[PDB]
Amino acid sequence: PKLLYTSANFLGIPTNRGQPKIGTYQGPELIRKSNFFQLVAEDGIQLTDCGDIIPVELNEAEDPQRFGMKWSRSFSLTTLRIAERVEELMKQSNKSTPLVIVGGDHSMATGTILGHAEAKPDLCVLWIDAHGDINTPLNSASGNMHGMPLSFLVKELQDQIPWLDDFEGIKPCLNASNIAYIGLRDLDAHETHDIRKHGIAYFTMLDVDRMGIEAVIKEALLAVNPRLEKAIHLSFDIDALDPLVAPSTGTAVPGGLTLREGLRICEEVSATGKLSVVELAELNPLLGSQEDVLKTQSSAVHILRACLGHCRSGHLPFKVRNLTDQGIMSRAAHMQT
Amino acid sequence: PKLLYTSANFLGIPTNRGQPKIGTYQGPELIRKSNFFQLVAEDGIQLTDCGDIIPVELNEAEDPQRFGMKWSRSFSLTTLRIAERVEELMKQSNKSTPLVIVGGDHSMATGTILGHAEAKPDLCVLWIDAHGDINTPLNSASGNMHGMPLSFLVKELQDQIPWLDDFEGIKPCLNASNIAYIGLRDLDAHETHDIRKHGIAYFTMLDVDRMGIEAVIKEALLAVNPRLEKAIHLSFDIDALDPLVAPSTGTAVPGGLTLREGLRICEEVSATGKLSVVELAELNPLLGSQEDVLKTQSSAVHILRACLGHCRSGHLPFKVRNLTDQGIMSRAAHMQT
Amino acid sequence: PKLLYTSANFLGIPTNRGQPKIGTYQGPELIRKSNFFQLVAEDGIQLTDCGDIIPVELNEAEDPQRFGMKWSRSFSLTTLRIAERVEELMKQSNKSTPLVIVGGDHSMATGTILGHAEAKPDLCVLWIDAHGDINTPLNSASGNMHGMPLSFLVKELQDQIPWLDDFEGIKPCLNASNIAYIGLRDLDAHETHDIRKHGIAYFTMLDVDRMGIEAVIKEALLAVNPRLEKAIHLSFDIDALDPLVAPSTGTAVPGGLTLREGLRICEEVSATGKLSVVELAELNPLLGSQEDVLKTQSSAVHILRACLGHCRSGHLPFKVRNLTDQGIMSRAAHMQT
Ligand SMILES: N[C@@H](CSCC[B-](O)(O)O)C(=O)O
Ligand SMILES: N[C@@H](CSCC[B-](O)(O)O)C(=O)O
Ligand SMILES: N[C@@H](CSCC[B-](O)(O)O)C(=O)O
Ligand SMILES: [Mn+2]
Ligand SMILES: [Mn+2]
Ligand SMILES: [Mn+2]
Ligand SMILES: [Mn+2]
Ligand SMILES: [Mn+2]
Ligand SMILES: [Mn+2]
């Protein structure tokens, strides 16, 4: 057998202040509960559990609304804390060692990318999501941070981000030409404006319907990593998949990716040999029935396994078992006498 | 932003005598209950609620079976009543103003098309359905009117329709060359005979599998509206979609259209700028679980929004919010000092 | 109308010793309970019920584990019993008469193919499954016979099958070049080794994603029956279909075939005019909710109907009903006076 990645790191980030629905903090445990670790090992990969990042959760009286944003100071404090740990993990392993991150709501992405970009500043980002998550604070109708994580990272958008002192440590590390969306089907108007204005590459479900997922992946990589020179940060919101496949998530949107389409994305990104960080966001075991949570867990595991290099086409055994070395009479041997 | 249709009309038709399962009369309310109106408004479209048509529901003793048909006199009386109102609405708005109609079982289609054809006699019809709904009375095994609505409209079939005095006002206004089916997977034998005999264009799920939905739509329009000269009556039976997507309907048939395929049909028809009337039939909130009804409602809303011109690719904002006119210090401005 | 097959045989095999989960013995009854027979008749086909094969179910004390295998002696005794009956049925009908077989777990396949190959030795096999079912006894982690049925049949694998006296009657009748897989997504490593080593044709879900089901079917037939000269044994594991479509099965694996893709396989194989035996395995009415069992039953019926030649494009009536021979006044006739 052969493997692009022979070892990987696992990191849990139970962020739950990016959106009002409680349960995303149970995200990392939902994956740890599963047979994910067992399965990755059987594929011949050494997965090291790097524990969980403790997010900063201020008391409501310590964190009033600022510019409509909810839990903004918790966000800024958590962001920096994420960035510090991710940077350490990335520099420590600097045939690479991918970081698998499990959220947690998507607001964590500001921290992960920032820390990732501090170790590999030339990275590109593949954002798999039903939503843009690129609302700027004054344009956000909800005030939820999981809908704004990209806006603090994109240089071309900094004249639309309100200055806040606790936000100074969060320096924009992304050019608009380094991001590519796949799976969009619920963009806010101002997101659509910014995405088109600054030429951010995006492939919606409409594009997936007209082009096919195979062409979309090829075009997404062509746009942000044309010669596979750049490290890849793969940000995978679980709600990019259709709700029939992953119902246990906060903002489900019908008409999403099939599990197979999602797997194709991960398999292709994995095969570049350039997967640096994969993050899975918006898992919420407190939403839906037990069967719903089981379905969502199952989809998450298959997706993450795909990122680490698992092939549906099969894997060769690390040692071939021969029947005669075990001194056992085979049927072929019996009739030969 | 730009819009093909800037205003539209909403009309409810709670027909429930076209089929034995009670609940389709709650169809229009299921859509009114939803956020459909709110969402259409946010897309920049003025939706006017034109109320509901009161269908004629005779007492069983007033409406005995005739030629196997159930509730035939209720059908004829209701048909004419539908036709009168639809004609008024169409002539009143004669950049068009589309009519959105929500049923109600599919027997209403005889009335809507008749009234529509009275204002726009050169119309073509796109029938999205698992079934032909073109059984002639003596060939119908069930005797349900929702399985015969097209047969009273097609000129080439009038030698197969039993003469009834109360049916005189229902004059065939459709040539067989004006109809195109998409989504068929449960045709009765005599429907298959008539469809092939008179050269009615039809694309079954088999065709969708072998050609892809994109080619099917193009071929369907090519067959009945080759140069986008004709107004389009879009008759959308909800059971055309797969039961996994829309379970709350009377005659569900496995192996149907995905939500995405259905959306593609509506998006393309909408983009012709020729959508005159869109009708959605066979919603039944009294079938299946609450989650089933929620799923069916959700699918209906996304479909109808697609007809009115909603793009999954995003919509531009009607006014761009600038951070400096609001007199707020942006991060870009702060560092520039 | 026209029909490739005008008559067919139905045979139930309630095998339940190939896997630990009880309920697959209720498989044949689940199909008999359905409207399958009624529907096949309406398509104009004479289905003869050939009853059920009574599988051999030894007492645990009579059937200890041998080489890790569970219920191996029950397997060998049952296999021979299956083979004897299938051979009789095949020679008896030797425009062919297809055998429709309903399991029962997939361990029955050793018996059916053996008996089938005894009447038509030049047959090819189309294996539709999430799994290879080609584990050799010493390589099997589970020791379940439903995971090994193919290994006893493939000549190239006989040096990997442990000699057992009760297994002598089971002679390998298949060359590796006569088998083609469709739908694989959960191969064991040693299966992957054997499949690639001996050049067995296989198309995984990855292949289905990149090629499309239409190309996969064409390539599968090209590999094992290039000129439609060989009779076809179609072995269809229900878990080849996605769990959303067929949840009531023992080893469900996400990311499977849609119902439409499965139907395409059956429709194409049927259209060769070379369908000799179709078997449906792994139905288990004791797994999942009532709605789950209903969904699984429904999928099974549509699949089997497709094998017998049912077209979603419609069937012509065996006698056209004219309105005037019945002495009834048509609307066309009324206005003509
Ligand atoms: N426009 C919405 C987008 S929410 C999407 C959140 B997510 O992608 O993380 O699930 C908002 O600003 O809250
Ligand atoms: N052959 C059936 C067709 S029923 C289809 C009804 B509908 O398309 O409206 O759900 C019949 O005549 O009742
Ligand atoms: N590797 C597994 C495969 S089980 C597949 C069983 B079946 O295809 O019949 O559902 C085993 O040896 O038990
Ligand atoms: Mn999202
Ligand atoms: Mn997100
Ligand atoms: Mn229908
Ligand atoms: Mn209909
Ligand atoms: Mn299987
Ligand atoms: Mn199997």
Side-chain angles (χ1 to χ4, degrees), chain A residues 214 244-245 259-260 264 267 291 295 298 302 312-317 319-323 326 328-332 334-335, chain C residues 67 138-139 158-163 167-168 170 187 189-190 192-193 196 202 204-206 208-210 244 254-256 261:
Chain A
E214 301 296 323
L244 283 167
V245 169
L259 178 55
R260 289 157 56 182
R264 284 304 295 135
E267 289 166 338
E291 186 180 5
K295 286 175 175 176
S298 186
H302 284 271
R312 297 181 270 164
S313 48
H315 288 268
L316 264 10
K319 216 292 297 179
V320 180
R321 302 172 99 273
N322 201 20
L323 201 56
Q326 313 185 220
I328 305 180
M329 178 63 52
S330 76
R331 190 210 172 85
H334 176 86
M335 313 291 289
Chain C
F67 300 107
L138 268 279
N139 291 337
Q158 286 321 292
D159 61 343
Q160 298 309 319
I161 310 299
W163 169 252
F167 272 68
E168 187 179 5
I170 309 178
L187 285 173
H190 292 287
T192 306
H193 176 90
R196 295 185 187 174
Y202 69 111
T204 69
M205 291 315 296
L206 200 236
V208 178
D209 286 347
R210 296 197 299 223
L244 283 167
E261 285 170 327

Coordinates of all heavy atoms in Angstrom, one line a residue, chain A residues 214 244-245 259-260 264 267 291 295 298 302 312-317 319-323 326 328-332 334-335, chain C residues 67 138-139 158-163 167-168 170 187 189-190 192-193 196 202 204-206 208-210 244 254-256 261:
Chain A
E214 N -17.4 17.1 -10.1 CA -16.0 16.9 -10.6 C -15.4 18.1 -11.2 O -14.3 18.5 -10.9 CB -16.0 15.7 -11.6 CG -16.5 14.4 -11.1 CD -15.7 13.9 -9.9 OE1 -14.5 14.0 -10.0 OE2 -16.3 13.3 -9.0
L244 N -31.0 15.8 4.7 CA -31.3 14.3 4.7 C -30.1 13.5 5.1 O -30.3 12.4 5.6 CB -31.8 13.9 3.3 CG -33.2 14.3 2.9 CD1 -33.4 14.0 1.4 CD2 -34.2 13.5 3.6
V245 N -28.9 14.0 4.9 CA -27.7 13.3 5.2 C -27.1 13.8 6.5 O -26.5 13.0 7.3 CB -26.7 13.6 4.1 CG1 -25.3 13.1 4.4 CG2 -27.2 12.9 2.8
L259 N -23.8 13.0 0.1 CA -22.7 12.5 0.8 C -21.5 12.2 -0.2 O -20.4 12.5 0.1 CB -23.0 11.3 1.7 CG -21.8 10.7 2.4 CD1 -21.1 11.8 3.3 CD2 -22.2 9.5 3.3
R260 N -21.9 11.7 -1.3 CA -21.0 11.3 -2.3 C -20.3 12.5 -2.9 O -19.1 12.4 -3.2 CB -21.7 10.5 -3.4 CG -22.1 9.1 -3.0 CD -23.2 8.5 -3.8 NE -22.9 8.5 -5.3 CZ -23.7 8.1 -6.2 NH1 -24.9 7.7 -5.9 NH2 -23.4 8.1 -7.5
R264 N -16.3 13.3 -2.7 CA -15.5 13.7 -3.8 C -14.6 14.9 -3.6 O -13.4 14.9 -4.0 CB -16.3 13.9 -5.1 CG -16.9 12.6 -5.7 CD -15.7 11.6 -6.0 NE -14.8 12.2 -7.1 CZ -13.5 12.1 -7.0 NH1 -12.9 11.6 -6.0 NH2 -12.8 12.7 -8.0
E267 N -11.8 13.7 -1.1 CA -10.9 12.8 -1.7 C -10.0 13.5 -2.7 O -8.8 13.2 -2.7 CB -11.7 11.7 -2.5 CG -12.4 10.7 -1.6 CD -13.4 9.9 -2.4 OE1 -13.9 10.4 -3.5 OE2 -13.8 8.8 -1.9
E291 N -31.7 9.0 15.8 CA -31.3 8.5 14.5 C -30.8 9.7 13.7 O -29.9 9.4 12.8 CB -32.6 7.9 13.8 CG -32.3 7.3 12.5 CD -33.6 6.7 11.9 OE1 -34.7 6.9 12.5 OE2 -33.5 6.0 10.8
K295 N -27.1 9.7 12.1 CA -26.9 10.0 10.6 C -25.8 11.0 10.4 O -24.9 10.9 9.6 CB -28.2 10.4 10.0 CG -29.2 9.3 9.7 CD -30.5 9.9 9.2 CE -31.4 8.7 8.8 NZ -32.7 9.3 8.4
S298 N -22.4 9.7 11.4 CA -21.9 8.8 10.3 C -21.3 9.6 9.2 O -20.3 9.3 8.6 CB -23.0 7.9 9.9 OG -22.6 7.0 9.0
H302 N -17.3 9.6 7.7 CA -16.9 9.3 6.4 C -16.2 10.4 5.7 O -15.3 10.2 4.9 CB -18.2 8.9 5.6 CG -18.7 7.5 5.8 ND1 -18.2 6.4 5.2 CD2 -19.6 7.1 6.7 CE1 -18.9 5.3 5.6 NE2 -19.7 5.7 6.6
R312 N -12.6 4.6 -1.2 CA -13.7 3.7 -1.4 C -13.4 2.6 -2.3 O -14.1 1.5 -2.4 CB -14.9 4.5 -1.9 CG -15.4 5.6 -1.0 CD -16.6 6.3 -1.5 NE -16.3 7.4 -2.3 CZ -17.1 8.0 -3.2 NH1 -18.4 7.6 -3.3 NH2 -16.7 9.0 -3.9
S313 N -12.3 2.8 -3.1 CA -11.8 1.8 -4.1 C -11.1 0.6 -3.4 O -10.7 -0.4 -4.0 CB -11.0 2.4 -5.1 OG -10.0 3.3 -4.5
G314 N -10.9 0.7 -2.1 CA -10.2 -0.3 -1.3 C -8.7 0.0 -1.0 O -8.1 0.8 -1.7
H315 N -8.2 -0.6 0.1 CA -6.9 -0.5 0.5 C -6.2 -1.9 0.5 O -6.8 -2.9 0.9 CB -6.7 0.1 1.9 CG -7.0 1.6 1.9 ND1 -6.1 2.6 1.7 CD2 -8.2 2.3 2.0 CE1 -6.6 3.8 1.8 NE2 -7.9 3.6 2.0
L316 N -4.9 -1.9 0.0 CA -4.2 -3.2 0.1 C -3.7 -3.5 1.5 O -3.5 -2.6 2.3 CB -2.9 -3.1 -0.8 CG -3.1 -3.6 -2.3 CD1 -4.5 -4.0 -2.6 CD2 -2.5 -2.6 -3.3
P317 N -3.7 -4.8 1.8 CA -3.2 -5.3 3.1 C -1.7 -5.1 3.3 O -1.0 -5.2 2.4 CB -3.6 -6.8 3.1 CG -3.5 -7.2 1.7 CD -4.0 -6.0 0.9
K319 N 0.2 -6.9 4.9 CA 0.9 -8.2 4.9 C -0.1 -9.2 4.3 O -1.2 -9.4 4.9 CB 1.4 -8.6 6.3 CG 2.7 -9.4 6.2 CD 2.6 -10.8 5.6 CE 1.6 -11.7 6.4 NZ 1.4 -13.0 5.8
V320 N 0.3 -9.9 3.3 CA -0.6 -10.9 2.6 C -0.6 -12.2 3.3 O 0.5 -12.8 3.5 CB -0.2 -11.1 1.1 CG1 -1.2 -12.1 0.5 CG2 -0.3 -9.7 0.4
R321 N -1.7 -12.7 3.7 CA -1.8 -14.0 4.4 C -1.8 -15.2 3.4 O -2.7 -15.3 2.5 CB -3.1 -14.0 5.3 CG -3.1 -12.9 6.3 CD -4.4 -12.9 7.0 NE -4.4 -13.5 8.4 CZ -4.6 -14.8 8.6 NH1 -4.9 -15.6 7.5 NH2 -4.5 -15.3 9.8
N322 N -0.8 -16.0 3.5 CA -0.8 -17.2 2.6 C -1.2 -18.4 3.4 O -0.9 -18.6 4.6 CB 0.7 -17.4 2.1 CG 0.7 -18.3 0.9 OD1 -0.3 -18.5 0.2 ND2 1.9 -18.9 0.6
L323 N -2.0 -19.3 2.8 CA -2.6 -20.4 3.5 C -1.6 -21.6 3.9 O -1.8 -22.3 4.8 CB -3.8 -21.0 2.7 CG -4.8 -21.8 3.6 CD1 -5.3 -20.9 4.7 CD2 -6.0 -22.2 2.7
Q326 N 0.8 -21.2 7.0 CA 0.1 -21.5 8.2 C -0.1 -23.0 8.4 O -0.7 -23.5 9.3 CB -1.3 -20.8 8.2 CG -1.2 -19.3 7.9 CD -2.6 -18.7 8.0 OE1 -2.9 -17.8 7.2 NE2 -3.3 -19.0 9.1
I328 N -1.7 -25.1 6.5 CA -3.1 -25.6 6.3 C -3.4 -26.1 4.9 O -3.0 -25.5 3.9 CB -4.1 -24.5 6.6 CG1 -3.9 -23.9 8.0 CG2 -5.6 -25.0 6.5 CD1 -4.8 -22.8 8.4
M329 N -4.1 -27.3 4.8 CA -4.4 -27.9 3.6 C -5.5 -27.1 2.8 O -6.6 -27.0 3.3 CB -4.9 -29.3 3.8 CG -5.3 -30.1 2.6 SD -4.0 -30.3 1.4 CE -2.7 -31.0 2.5
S330 N -5.1 -26.5 1.7 CA -6.0 -25.8 0.8 C -6.8 -26.8 -0.1 O -6.3 -27.9 -0.3 CB -5.3 -24.8 0.0 OG -4.6 -25.4 -1.1
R331 N -7.9 -26.4 -0.6 CA -8.7 -27.2 -1.4 C -8.0 -27.5 -2.7 O -8.0 -28.6 -3.3 CB -10.1 -26.6 -1.8 CG -11.0 -27.5 -2.5 CD -12.0 -26.8 -3.4 NE -12.7 -27.8 -4.2 CZ -13.8 -28.4 -3.8 NH1 -14.3 -28.1 -2.6 NH2 -14.5 -29.3 -4.6
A332 N -7.2 -26.5 -3.2 CA -6.4 -26.7 -4.4 C -5.3 -27.8 -4.2 O -5.0 -28.6 -5.1 CB -5.8 -25.4 -4.8
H334 N -5.5 -30.2 -1.9 CA -6.1 -31.5 -1.6 C -6.4 -32.3 -2.9 O -6.1 -33.5 -3.0 CB -7.4 -31.3 -0.8 CG -8.1 -32.6 -0.6 ND1 -7.9 -33.4 0.5 CD2 -9.1 -33.2 -1.3 CE1 -8.7 -34.5 0.4 NE2 -9.4 -34.4 -0.6
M335 N -6.9 -31.6 -3.9 CA -7.3 -32.2 -5.2 C -6.1 -32.5 -6.0 O -6.1 -33.3 -7.0 CB -8.3 -31.3 -5.9 CG -9.4 -30.8 -5.1 SD -10.6 -32.0 -4.5 CE -11.4 -32.4 -6.1
Chain C
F67 N -12.2 -23.1 11.3 CA -11.4 -22.0 10.6 C -12.1 -20.7 10.8 O -12.1 -19.9 9.9 CB -11.1 -22.3 9.2 CG -10.4 -23.6 8.9 CD1 -11.0 -24.7 8.4 CD2 -9.0 -23.7 9.2 CE1 -10.3 -25.9 8.2 CE2 -8.3 -24.8 9.0 CZ -9.0 -26.0 8.5
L138 N -9.9 -17.8 6.2 CA -8.8 -17.4 7.1 C -8.6 -15.9 7.2 O -7.9 -15.4 8.1 CB -7.5 -18.2 6.8 CG -7.2 -19.5 7.5 CD1 -6.7 -19.3 8.9 CD2 -8.5 -20.4 7.6
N139 N -9.2 -15.2 6.2 CA -9.0 -13.8 6.1 C -10.3 -13.0 6.7 O -10.2 -11.8 6.9 CB -8.8 -13.3 4.7 CG -7.4 -13.7 4.2 OD1 -6.5 -13.9 5.0 ND2 -7.3 -13.8 2.9
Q158 N -8.8 -21.0 -5.1 CA -8.9 -22.3 -4.4 C -7.7 -22.7 -3.5 O -7.9 -23.6 -2.7 CB -9.3 -23.4 -5.4 CG -10.7 -23.3 -5.9 CD -11.7 -22.9 -4.7 OE1 -11.9 -23.7 -3.8 NE2 -12.3 -21.7 -4.8
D159 N -6.6 -22.0 -3.7 CA -5.4 -22.3 -2.9 C -5.5 -21.5 -1.6 O -4.6 -21.5 -0.8 CB -4.1 -22.0 -3.6 CG -4.0 -20.5 -4.1 OD1 -5.1 -19.8 -4.1 OD2 -2.9 -20.1 -4.4
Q160 N -6.6 -20.7 -1.4 CA -6.8 -19.9 -0.2 C -8.0 -20.4 0.6 O -8.3 -19.9 1.7 CB -7.0 -18.5 -0.6 CG -5.8 -17.8 -1.2 CD -4.5 -18.1 -0.5 OE1 -4.4 -18.1 0.7 NE2 -3.4 -18.4 -1.2
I161 N -8.7 -21.5 0.1 CA -9.8 -22.1 0.8 C -9.4 -23.3 1.5 O -8.9 -24.3 0.9 CB -11.0 -22.4 -0.2 CG1 -11.3 -21.2 -1.1 CG2 -12.2 -22.9 0.6 CD1 -11.8 -20.0 -0.3
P162 N -9.5 -23.3 2.8 CA -9.2 -24.5 3.7 C -10.0 -25.7 3.2 O -11.2 -25.6 3.1 CB -9.6 -24.1 5.1 CG -9.6 -22.6 5.0 CD -10.0 -22.2 3.6
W163 N -9.3 -26.9 3.0 CA -10.0 -28.1 2.7 C -10.9 -28.6 3.8 O -10.5 -28.7 5.0 CB -9.0 -29.2 2.3 CG -9.7 -30.5 2.2 CD1 -9.6 -31.6 3.0 CD2 -10.6 -30.9 1.2 NE1 -10.4 -32.6 2.6 CE2 -11.0 -32.3 1.5 CE3 -11.2 -30.3 0.0 CZ2 -11.9 -33.0 0.7 CZ3 -12.1 -31.0 -0.7 CH2 -12.4 -32.4 -0.4
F167 N -17.3 -29.9 2.2 CA -17.2 -28.8 1.1 C -16.9 -29.4 -0.3 O -16.8 -28.6 -1.2 CB -16.2 -27.8 1.5 CG -16.8 -26.7 2.4 CD1 -17.2 -26.9 3.7 CD2 -16.9 -25.4 1.9 CE1 -17.8 -25.9 4.4 CE2 -17.5 -24.4 2.6 CZ -17.9 -24.6 3.9
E168 N -16.6 -30.7 -0.4 CA -16.2 -31.3 -1.6 C -17.2 -31.1 -2.8 O -16.8 -30.9 -3.9 CB -15.8 -32.7 -1.5 CG -15.2 -33.4 -2.7 CD -14.8 -34.8 -2.5 OE1 -15.2 -35.4 -1.5 OE2 -14.2 -35.4 -3.5
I170 N -19.0 -28.7 -3.3 CA -19.0 -27.3 -3.8 C -17.8 -27.1 -4.7 O -16.7 -26.7 -4.2 CB -19.0 -26.4 -2.6 CG1 -20.1 -26.7 -1.6 CG2 -19.1 -24.9 -3.0 CD1 -20.1 -25.8 -0.3
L187 N -14.9 -2.5 1.0 CA -14.1 -3.7 0.8 C -13.1 -3.9 1.9 O -12.4 -2.9 2.4 CB -13.3 -3.5 -0.5 CG -14.0 -3.7 -1.8 CD1 -13.0 -3.3 -3.0 CD2 -14.5 -5.1 -2.0
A189 N -9.4 -5.3 3.2 CA -8.1 -5.2 2.5 C -7.8 -6.5 1.7 O -7.3 -6.3 0.6 CB -7.0 -4.9 3.5
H190 N -8.0 -7.6 2.2 CA -7.7 -8.9 1.5 C -8.6 -9.1 0.3 O -8.2 -9.8 -0.6 CB -7.7 -10.1 2.5 CG -6.6 -10.0 3.5 ND1 -5.3 -10.3 3.2 CD2 -6.6 -9.7 4.9 CE1 -4.6 -10.2 4.3 NE2 -5.3 -9.8 5.3
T192 N -9.7 -6.6 -1.5 CA -9.1 -5.7 -2.4 C -7.8 -6.3 -3.1 O -7.6 -6.2 -4.3 CB -8.6 -4.4 -1.8 OG1 -9.7 -3.8 -1.0 CG2 -8.1 -3.3 -2.8
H193 N -7.1 -7.0 -2.3 CA -5.9 -7.7 -2.8 C -6.3 -8.8 -3.9 O -5.7 -8.8 -5.0 CB -5.1 -8.4 -1.7 CG -3.9 -9.2 -2.2 ND1 -2.7 -8.6 -2.3 CD2 -3.8 -10.5 -2.5 CE1 -1.9 -9.6 -2.7 NE2 -2.5 -10.7 -2.9
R196 N -7.9 -7.3 -7.2 CA -6.9 -6.7 -8.1 C -5.9 -7.7 -8.7 O -5.6 -7.6 -9.8 CB -6.2 -5.6 -7.4 CG -7.0 -4.4 -7.0 CD -6.2 -3.3 -6.4 NE -7.1 -2.2 -5.9 CZ -6.7 -1.1 -5.3 NH1 -5.4 -1.0 -5.0 NH2 -7.6 -0.2 -4.8
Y202 N -14.3 -4.5 -11.4 CA -15.1 -3.8 -10.3 C -15.2 -2.3 -10.5 O -14.3 -1.6 -10.9 CB -14.4 -4.2 -9.0 CG -13.1 -3.5 -8.7 CD1 -13.0 -2.5 -7.7 CD2 -12.0 -3.9 -9.4 CE1 -11.7 -1.9 -7.5 CE2 -10.7 -3.3 -9.2 CZ -10.6 -2.3 -8.2 OH -9.4 -1.7 -8.0
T204 N -16.6 0.8 -8.2 CA -17.0 1.3 -6.9 C -17.8 2.5 -7.0 O -18.1 3.0 -8.1 CB -15.7 1.6 -6.1 OG1 -15.1 2.8 -6.6 CG2 -14.8 0.4 -6.0
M205 N -18.3 3.0 -5.9 CA -19.1 4.2 -5.9 C -18.3 5.4 -6.4 O -18.8 6.3 -7.0 CB -19.6 4.5 -4.5 CG -20.7 3.5 -4.0 SD -21.9 3.2 -5.3 CE -22.6 4.9 -5.5
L206 N -16.9 5.3 -6.2 CA -16.0 6.3 -6.7 C -16.1 6.3 -8.3 O -16.2 7.4 -8.9 CB -14.6 6.0 -6.3 CG -13.5 7.0 -6.3 CD1 -12.3 6.5 -7.1 CD2 -13.9 8.4 -6.8
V208 N -18.7 5.2 -10.0 CA -20.0 5.7 -10.3 C -20.1 7.2 -10.3 O -20.7 7.8 -11.1 CB -21.1 5.0 -9.4 CG1 -22.5 5.6 -9.7 CG2 -21.0 3.5 -9.5
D209 N -19.4 7.8 -9.3 CA -19.3 9.2 -9.2 C -18.6 9.9 -10.4 O -19.0 10.9 -11.0 CB -18.6 9.7 -7.9 CG -19.5 9.5 -6.7 OD1 -20.7 9.3 -6.9 OD2 -19.0 9.6 -5.6
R210 N -17.4 9.3 -10.8 CA -16.6 9.9 -11.9 C -17.1 9.5 -13.3 O -16.8 10.3 -14.2 CB -15.1 9.5 -11.7 CG -14.5 10.0 -10.4 CD -13.0 10.0 -10.5 NE -12.5 8.6 -10.6 CZ -11.4 8.2 -10.0 NH1 -10.8 8.9 -9.1 NH2 -11.0 6.9 -10.2
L244 N -30.8 5.5 3.0 CA -32.0 6.4 2.9 C -33.1 5.7 2.1 O -34.3 6.0 2.3 CB -31.6 7.7 2.3 CG -30.8 8.7 3.2 CD1 -30.3 9.8 2.4 CD2 -31.7 9.3 4.3
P254 N -23.5 4.1 4.1 CA -23.8 5.4 3.6 C -23.1 5.6 2.3 O -22.0 5.1 2.0 CB -23.3 6.3 4.6 CG -23.3 5.6 5.9 CD -22.9 4.2 5.5
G255 N -23.7 6.5 1.4 CA -23.1 6.9 0.2 C -23.3 5.8 -0.9 O -22.4 5.6 -1.8
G256 N -24.5 5.2 -0.9 CA -24.8 4.1 -1.9 C -25.5 4.6 -3.1 O -25.5 5.8 -3.4
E261 N -30.4 4.9 -9.9 CA -29.2 4.2 -10.4 C -29.3 2.7 -10.3 O -28.9 2.0 -11.3 CB -28.0 4.6 -9.5 CG -27.5 6.1 -9.8 CD -26.4 6.5 -8.8 OE1 -26.5 6.2 -7.7 OE2 -25.5 7.3 -9.3

